[PDB]
Design a protein around this ligand. Sequence first.
Ligand SMILES: *[C@@H]1O[C@H](CO)[C@@H](O[C@@H]2O[C@H](CO)[C@@H](O[C@@H]3O[C@H](CO)[C@@H](O)[C@H](O)[C@@H]3O)[C@H](O)[C@H]2NC(C)=O)[C@H](O)[C@H]1NC(C)=O
Ligand SMILES: *[C@@H]1O[C@H](CO)[C@@H](O)[C@H](O)[C@H]1NC(C)=O
Lengths: 354, 376
Amino acid sequence: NSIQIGGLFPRGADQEYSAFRVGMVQFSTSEFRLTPHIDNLEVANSFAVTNAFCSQFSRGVYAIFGFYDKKSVNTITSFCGTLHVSFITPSFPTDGTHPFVIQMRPDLKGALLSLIEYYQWDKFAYLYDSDRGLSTLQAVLDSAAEKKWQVTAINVGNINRRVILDCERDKVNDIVDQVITIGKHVKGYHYIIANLGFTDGDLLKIQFGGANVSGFQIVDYDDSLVSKFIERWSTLEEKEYPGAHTATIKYTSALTYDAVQVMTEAFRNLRKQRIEISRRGNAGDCLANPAVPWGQGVEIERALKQVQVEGLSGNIKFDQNGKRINYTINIMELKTNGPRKIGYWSEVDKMVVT
Amino acid sequence: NSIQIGGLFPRGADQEYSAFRVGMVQFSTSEFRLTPHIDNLEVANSFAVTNAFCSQFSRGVYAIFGFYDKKSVNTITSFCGTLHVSFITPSFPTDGTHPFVIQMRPDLKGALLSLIEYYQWDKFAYLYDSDRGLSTLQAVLDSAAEKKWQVTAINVGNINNDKKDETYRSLFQDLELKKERRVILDCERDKVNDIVDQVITIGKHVKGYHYIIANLGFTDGDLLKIQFGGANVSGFQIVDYDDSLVSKFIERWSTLEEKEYPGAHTATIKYTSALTYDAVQVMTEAFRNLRKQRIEISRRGNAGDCLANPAVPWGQGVEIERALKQVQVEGLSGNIKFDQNGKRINYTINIMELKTNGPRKIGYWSEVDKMVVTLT
Ligand SMILES: *[C@@H]1O[C@H](CO)[C@@H](O[C@@H]2O[C@H](CO)[C@@H](O[C@@H]3O[C@H](CO)[C@@H](O)[C@H](O)[C@@H]3O)[C@H](O)[C@H]2NC(C)=O)[C@H](O)[C@H]1NC(C)=O
Ligand SMILES: *[C@@H]1O[C@H](CO)[C@@H](O)[C@H](O)[C@H]1NC(C)=O
């Protein structure tokens, strides 16, 4: 039979939607068909997000794949928790209690703290914006006081030589451009770029003026799964799949493809347990208070969190709060030849060289 | 005539509701009154906040008075901006700009930064609560490089959490190992003594500490030097009990029966309750001149109308928004005036210290000048 799911995409997230579509084809099975209902909206607009969520809810969707941002994350978490509708997302993870949110993106805070320690930094700047949450800010401040670090933590998000940049890609360019412009000790700087897409396109087109640059990567192109994927992705018709026909894939797009794998696996597992996922009967007003307890929702959430598969972002496994666990983050440096992996980080071993 | 308004109150805002009711009596006249419809909600729950806001929208109110927190502020700003219904609030003011929001609460960050400079601090602990918000901490961290401040930031919002032992370890390392004696407390006003009590059991030579209470209600709770272990204590106050307007209010408020008016029968009023009373004055002054629309029937609201009904035409809603922002009155929180984004301007924050005889005003911070001025 067909299983209804929702898709909540930001306007302009073209590559991610192409990755979603490619995943829908790749992970298709004879057992059931995933029938997606797509909405494109401004995810920063909580009213619009509410409208889209309610639309999906009323179509009886069994799960929603989508994105949020700092302004709408609370709408998503509260509506998911209230209605027992699972939201699977490549957006920034959160540390709070968020039943019914499955976060495809691994937490970077631990790898970042381990890297600062690996380079033996004790004095540095953390230049950040709030677009990916403030948990990383809090974690840096916590560790600073513990290890006697002197940290200069500046919010660059509202603006009209060891440096961590945890900000929008546009701002990285502006900041580095400024350092090279000043012309003082340009090569003596060391930037750590606090995101999971070191080699994703744009970042390494920046002229760093010979400074040291380090970062992180969750998609390992040496992986058999990934190289095989890229072999096909790199030859797709860009007209048909905007953002495709590239040698690399943004990590958010890779997580979107992986999310389709996770959803498919969850529904396969529910089918194996004879848990009904065919079609919801009558869904009342979305904004009914109190909300009606939808029973299947709890099992669907459990099944999504129970999934274990290997994808483009490596080993995928979740804890009871929908957070990635048992993952690995590759630590990268920009060498004179190009970006190179210098080691990796996992929960159990922290940072391991080579 | 009468104008219908919404009132959205969090659980535990008992005194604020009493102040709202007292305001409705004070500012009503035989010629004009507000007719409120009160909903009581979990402000931390965005789904519940959405339901409440939308039900008021459905009923057809001129404005909604209410509260939000860190988790629900985006619901309020997005809904009032989309539906074009004005929301007037004593909650923490938002860092950015958002139409259809009237912020009764003056910004605190400016006065706090100025007070740190005034005392010539160069090193201090900043005890914050992440569930409360980090905007003020961020302002302090942003200024720390330029001002040469060594800040040790500790989330005491985790003092009872799973991060509890981590929180105590942090307090211990700063107070015992690093001998920190300057402490900023950025927290709920009624949590000050609980946090201080913990600090006192952890630190040493506590009589020598200097706390700044980063909150607009310095005297909202008991201030007993003995409770502070003999330390210096500084803070901020927007309700000035020397003001005739305020002392007259308190003369009346102090005899209201406490069962009937929870939180009243006191010699002080919480700054949030004062702002709630002032909000009734602002709405009254804004609305008394607006068009007397044809007397219609008021009916229970349906939250689903947020999706079923169109937004209030912008040209209609903006007239109410502008009327609110144009109000200039004196209230319990002093001079009330708004900029084009609904932020308080031209306000004054009193700077207080706990002295021998009790809390005393030692100076003030005006929004126009943005420095601490010392009083004789
Ligand atoms: C949880 O995480 C770890 C990755 O840290 C996964 O364990 C690893 O699994 C891979 C297979 O995907 C192992 O690599 C293989 O090793 C053998 C011999 O050691 C080699 O000849 C093969 O060609 C291949 O490279 C890796 O050794 C292993 N690592 C550890 C530390 O055990 C595990 O599968 C993940 N489990 C789940 C449920 O996600
Ligand atoms: C009131 O605010 C306006 C700015 O909008 C300014 O010109 C004036 O100085 C302020 N008045 C007082 C008394 O501070």
